[PDB]
Design a protein around this ligand. Sequence first.
Ligand SMILES: CCCCCCCCOCCOCCOCCOCCO
Ligand SMILES: CCCCCCCCOCCOCCOCCOCCO
Ligand SMILES: CCCCCCCCOCCOCCOCCOCCO
Ligand SMILES: CCCCCCCCOCCOCCOCCOCCO
Length: 550
Amino acid sequence: GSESQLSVRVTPANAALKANIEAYVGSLGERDEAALQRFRRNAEAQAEKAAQALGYFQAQIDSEVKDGKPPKLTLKVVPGEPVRLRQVNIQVLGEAASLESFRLPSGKQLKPGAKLNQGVYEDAKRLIQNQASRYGFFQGRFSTQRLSIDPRAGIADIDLVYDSGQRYTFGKVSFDGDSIIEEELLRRMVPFKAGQPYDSELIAELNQNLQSSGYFEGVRVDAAPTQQAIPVAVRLEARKPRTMGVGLGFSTDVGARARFNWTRHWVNAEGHSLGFESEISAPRQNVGAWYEIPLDPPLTDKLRFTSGYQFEDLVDTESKLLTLGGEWHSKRPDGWQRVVSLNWMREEYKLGDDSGLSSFLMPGIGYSLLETDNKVDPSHGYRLQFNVKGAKEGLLADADVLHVDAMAKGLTSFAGGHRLLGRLQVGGIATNDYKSIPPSLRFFAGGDQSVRGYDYRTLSPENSDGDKIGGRYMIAGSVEYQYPLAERWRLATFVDQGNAFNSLDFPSIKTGVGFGVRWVSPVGPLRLDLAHALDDDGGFRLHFSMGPEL
Ligand SMILES: CCCCCCCCOCCOCCOCCOCCO
Ligand SMILES: CCCCCCCCOCCOCCOCCOCCO
Ligand SMILES: CCCCCCCCOCCOCCOCCOCCO
Ligand SMILES: CCCCCCCCOCCOCCOCCOCCO
């Protein structure tokens, strides 16, 4: 069996108190009568702690033991009337009294009439002192601290008066270390000026800033209140000038896969970045290079020049694609990153048996947004991506083009860890010469991340002879439910719908449904799905994939 039963009866009923007592007492285990009898004093003790945490200081607690199958330790309890706050005086004086973002202790638990809960008082005090320390009120002193309780007549008074005194400020920022990065650049990624009101989260922001620039392998950003201005000392350890990286992966879409990167994290004092990268899979190989120049602000604004070469043999198309490009990234405080681009490309291609070659110089604008709990175990978050590019034939273009692609990903956790995943992707290309439009600019659907139940890029318009050539438009959507089965183990069920097509009037949407297993393994998030195609002649398909959900 064999677990012994614990029964808590409160008169009158009080579900809160009951559940609390049940959690505090814990599990009885597989204890027999004698063993339950030894356990009684612990049981009553725990029960009265549990009562005290909810404000009941006059709870009558008694315990019965009854042998049986299984044995039963019954707790009977008369709550009595609890302790309620009468007077509550929480005051923050000094400069902090006028500071906008200084949270005062608030809420139901501190309203007069509320049952006094364990540690709401200490919570209030901790909050006040934590914000005091965050905002540099280091001379902040509690002038009054009083929690007063009379269990008889059930009254409690809280008195917290906090004289905050003057607010400290940021002193000068100093930089030392074997970094060749000019201080001109380093100072433009300091999220505060000197003589500006102190904020420890700005120190943190500085820390993460320096860390994310890629320029160093270690940063020491420290400045304990000292010396009213706090000087800030930053020491920087220059990163290794060059770096190599290798990755292995697998997919149902493309199979075994190898990634390589060769990065140069600082080329010069002005913070330029160099890079090389490649990936090899049986159906697709590509190589790319890039150069980056920080603008202002250095971290959210930059120029990125790129080049690339890519071979692809997939389904019924082949393509050798060459590309050069200039990009201008800027990100607003939302998290909205805009990318203004000018890209030139040349594509050698075979659609079915028809060989084409066309080239385009195209401008584009993109918007991105990523908001998550993060970062490997996101419990909720979302990704938004919008991208439009276009070309004018004559102006270094073999055809006219208006290419649009958009994606939205979303994840939510609700209840006891049940997840819901939502996915939408849309694409469209307008042109006056579809035959001149190469594969990379056409749209395809189906696959692990597209419409499961269907092989990668197989959902597509076909020509006279039955070859999948690419759509003028596409949609792909999915809804997935995940059930937590263990730590690192989830059980999913999903529905995907989508297609690539040439006519808005005949989308011919295909549907896949199925279920799979998710595992946060020692090599990354693994997903294994079994999917049934409902449309065309649908059999079954095994999908496998790795990488973050978002
Ligand atoms: C999650 C582990 C990461 C895997 C890294 C690379 C492993 C490469 O997997 C090899 C898989 O080979 C078995 C399937 O390959 C057959 C594909 O079709 C062969 C053509 O007949
Ligand atoms: C845009 C957010 C709402 C869209 C959800 C439903 C999408 C409707 O199906 C789209 C299929 O057509 C593809 C074209 O969509 C993008 C615009 O086309 C650009 C061509 O000018
Ligand atoms: C993802 C965007 C939403 C698209 C909505 C339009 C859906 C159009 O097709 C719906 C067809 O019905 C779904 C199932 O069809 C398969 C037929 O056989 C099912 C037997 O179980
Ligand atoms: C994409 C559509 C998915 C909808 C089908 C779901 C079918 C599976 O049913 C799951 C029922 O689970 C009930 C949840 O209760 C479990 C609670 O225990 C764990 C959390 O405490």
